[PDB]
Design a protein around this ligand. Structure first.
Ligand SMILES: Nc1ncnc2c1ncn2[C@@H]1O[C@H](CSCC[C@H](N)C(=O)O)[C@@H](O)[C@H]1O
Length: 400
């Protein structure tokens, strides 16, 4: 029943002055608020720790993504200068594997610089410690936003995608980035015969279980109207959908960058090839808990709607398209992960470590693990056929 947290008073205050906030604003606050945000504040004080993600399972993952970067660079026409952008790099482990594994491709390696987009100073710090070669001391950690890898590759940190240079061919990597973006939640009302938005308000009822509560907008909000052409037209009463508008905006930026200067994006996450009705989850101490249970104290994740991403891109009607999704297992095998598995494994010649390597491979590709839950979609030029998407479906209805 009790008691009220510092963050729940700040969030209850927003609702008093501005009225009930969106799920989007709510998640934006819980994750990215200074000083209460789940990222930046707490669960770090070092290299995170709780980062159990695909790159952290196996160098195999990073190496396959690296082969993809090189193969895609080849299909683009071996541009002399190439940007590699990672959205939400985490510890930097994925990027570290890529830069380690792609060094042998001399021509490729000489054309690349890296741009990491990252909002958390703590994750920024971990990424830099890792990845960077420090030649002299007396580095000012935040003011100097650029550094150099031990192999001389240039890495620049930025807070938003918008700050990355434009008019240079660019690869974009987003791995467990989209599931941490804010979403809006919409619900159909027969009474209004229109969509309403689920909002977060005060809870000052008698038996108010958590201080905050899920309310519903009266009329259709700005956001409902803005996205109405992506919401199902057919609506039973109370029918409810999540939409990651933050991610759609990012998808549009990427699609347009590719349209202007060329490139390709690789978006990897757990999600569905359909609109997602309900997925927003809050985990804490290895248990699922209520989204409104001490907000800030639990990690909020979403399952990614790959379908709306794809449509949203295509709806720009320029040189970019979106191909996918395909299952992570199918993608990784199609990139040659089993060849690398046996190449790396042959070198280990320690049998207990070999089993370690295989188990991480199984986690990545086996359907009962990450193999099917995780999926891959690409944003790219219509003219340049992507690498690793031979199993992608053709969506004849959406292609006009
Ligand atoms: N709105 C936003 N803009 C930029 N970075 C963000 C963001 N929201 C979250 N992030 C960052 O994205 C990452 C999400 S966690 C995923 C980390 C890494 N990809 C891995 O596989 O382990 C974190 O580094 C977090 O700080």
């Amino acid at each position: 029943k009790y008691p009220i947290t510092d963050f729940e008073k700040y969030l209850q205050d927003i609702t008093k002055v501005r009225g009930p906030m969106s799920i989007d604003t709510f998640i934006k606050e819980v994750l990215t608020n200074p000083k209460y945000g789940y990222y930046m504040n707490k669960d770090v004080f070092g290299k995170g720790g709780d980062f159990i993600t695909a790159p952290e399972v196996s160098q195999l993952f990073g190496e396959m993504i690296g082969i993809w970067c090189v193969a895609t660079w080849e299909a683009m026409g071996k541009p002399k200068k190439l940007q590699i952008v990672e959205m939400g790099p985490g510890r930097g482990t994925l990027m570290k594997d890529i830069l380690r594994s792609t060094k042998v491709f001399k021509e490729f390696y000489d054309s690349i610089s890296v741009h990491l987009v990252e909002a958390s100073p703590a994750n920024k710090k971990t990424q830099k410690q890792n990845l960077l070669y420090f030649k002299d001391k007396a580095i000012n950690f935040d003011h100097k936003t650029i550094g150099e890898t031990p192999n001389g590759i240039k890495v620049t940190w930025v807070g938003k995608l918008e700050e990355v240079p434009t008019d240079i061919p660019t690869l974009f990597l987003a791995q467990e980035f989209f599931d941490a973006l804010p979403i809006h939640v919409f619900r159909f009302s027969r009474e209004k015969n229109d969509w309403c938005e689920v909002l977060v308000d005060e809870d000052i009822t008698e038996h108010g279980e958590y201080y905050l509560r899920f309310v519903q907008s009266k009329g259709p909000t700005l956001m409902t109207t803005a996205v109405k052409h992506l919401l199902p037209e057919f609506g039973l009463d109370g029918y409810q959908v999540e939409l990651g508008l933050a991610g759609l905006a990012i998808s549009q930026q990427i699609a347009n960058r590719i349209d202007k200067s060329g490139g390709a994006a690789l978006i990897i996450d757990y999600g569905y090839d359909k609109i997602v009705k309900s997925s927003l989850q809050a985990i804490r101490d290895h248990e699922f808990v209520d989204i409104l249970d001490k907000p800030g104290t639990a990690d909020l994740s979403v399952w990614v709607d790959f379908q709306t991403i794809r449509k949203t891109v295509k709806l720009l009607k320029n040189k970019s398209t979106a191909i996918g999704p395909v299952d992570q297992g199918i993608f990784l095998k199609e990139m040659g992960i089993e060849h690398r598995l046996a190449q790396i494994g042959r070198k280990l010649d320690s049998n207990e470590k070999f089993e370690e390597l295989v188990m991480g491979y199984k986690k990545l590709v086996d359907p009962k693990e990450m193999g099917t839950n995780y999926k891959v979609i690409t944003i790219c030029d219509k003219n340049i056929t992507p690498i690793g998407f031979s199993t992608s479906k053709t969506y004849d209805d959406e292609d006009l």
